[PDB]
Amino acid sequence: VPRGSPWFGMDIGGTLVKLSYFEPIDITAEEEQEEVESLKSIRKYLTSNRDVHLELKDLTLFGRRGNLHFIRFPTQDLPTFIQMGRDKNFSTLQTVLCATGGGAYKFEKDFGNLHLHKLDELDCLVKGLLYIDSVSFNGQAECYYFANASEPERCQKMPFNLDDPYPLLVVNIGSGVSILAVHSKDNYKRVTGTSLGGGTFLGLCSLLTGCESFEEALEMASKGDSTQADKLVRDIYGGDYERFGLPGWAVASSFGNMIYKEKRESVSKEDLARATLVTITNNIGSVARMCAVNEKINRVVFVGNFLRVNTLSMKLLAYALDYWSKGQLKALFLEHEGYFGAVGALLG
């Protein structure tokens, strides 16, 4: 049972803070009632620029019934959150501030007197992810996948039952990629990873197209055709590679056609961006598949800041895993992605 109150957990990023807080519903003390009213006021102010729809209602946490809320706000407003806490007499924002995230340390610097208790991102991620999945999404599906993944322009989002997720392979895609094998609530480890993640995508896009943000890079990619920069098996064999059954549409060499000056001249920014995304997603799908095989795990879930913009990346990842596993593995995703670190921090 957490000492002070109210109960919340935060994931301080370089730009945004992800905060999860618990709203108790069985209240008998006037002081707790206004504590709940203060939290609502705080939420409304901080979010004054979907998350509301992620609210988990009437769940039992630490023996008490309540609603779990999720909000995100600029790290620029974190000092305000802290002061609101002290002004509204929150004992949890008194002692020391617990939190995860990369902007955590940076923040404690800019910030008066305050002692930060830094928690590990991957540890918080795992704990929170497992917890949310255990309490379900208000009885509905917290986990989903894309049926007919082999057809990205036609696949459909469908729920997936992850009752007993164990064992589980968690592929975390941020600037880079960490892959965790989760055997139980307390048994898991980072089995491997790849340096070809979201940072490589944006990094290469910025140099090849001049884009200025992750949002812009993805937008270009959605409009491009990767097969204009990539050399396909068909470009080599004039169709499928019969001998080893490689289909003609399979990518033979990423950016392979960019070795010809002429091809480089006509290739569009949007094409290079989509080719960059396809190279990254197909490679991640391969690493995940081989790791799943080696770990003997058949449930692969993808999380990370890289999946927070468009569903395009998720669909290409589904397409990739389906391809490398010859349809045996399905790429899984979670509705509360982005808030697991926060939830993990709250549990701790």
Ligand X SMILES: CC(=O)SCCNC(=O)CCNC(=O)[C@H](O)C(C)(C)COP(=O)(O)OP(=O)(O)OC[C@H]1O[C@@H](n2cnc3c(N)ncnc32)[C@H](O)[C@@H]1OP(=O)(O)O
- Residues forming contacts to a copy of itself in the complex (CB under 8 A) are 102, 120, 122-123, 174-176, 178, 189-190, 192, 194-200, 202-204, 206-208, 212, 229-231, 236, 243-244, 250-259, 261, 264, 272, 279, 282-283, 286-287, 290-291, 293-294, 324
SS3 sequence of the chain:
CCCCCCCEEEEECCCEEEEEEEEECCCCCHHHHHHHHHHHHHHHHHCCCCCHHHCEEEEEECCEEEEEEEEEEEHHHHHHHHHHHHHCCCHHHCCCEEEECCHHHHHHHHCCCCCEEECCHHHHHHHHHHHHHHHCECCECCEEEEECCCCCCCCEEEECCCCCCCCEEEEEECCCEEEEEEEECCEEEEEEEECCCHHHHHHHHHHHHCCCCHHHHHHHHHHCCHHHCCEEHHHHHCCCEHHHCECCCCEEECCHHHHCHHHHHHCCHHHHHHHHHHHHHHHHHHHHHHHHHHHCCCCEEEECHHHCCCHHHHHHHHHHHHHHCCCCCCEEEECCCCCHHHHHHHHC
Cite the active site residues. Answer: 121
- Near ligand X by CB under 6 A: residue from 28, 113, 140, 195: 195
| Binding at 227: pick from a copy of itself, ligand X, none (beta carbon under 5-8 Å per type) | none
Q: Which does 202 bind (CB under 5 to 8 A by kind): ligand X, a copy of itself, none?
A: a copy of itself
- 190 marked ligand binding residue: yes
Residue nearer to a copy of itself on the CB measure, 84 or 229: 229
Question: Shortest Cβ distance from residue 294 to a copy of itself (Å)?
Answer: 5
323 binds, among a copy of itself, ligand X, none (CB under 5 to 8 A by kind): ligand X
Our CB check for a copy of itself shows the closer of 61 and 98 to be 98
Annotated binding site for acetyl-CoA: 175, 178, 190
The residues that touch ligand X, with contacts defined as CB under 6 A, are 102, 174-178, 193-195, 197, 233, 236, 241, 246, 250-253, 282, 305, 320, 323
Annotated binding site: 175, 178, 190
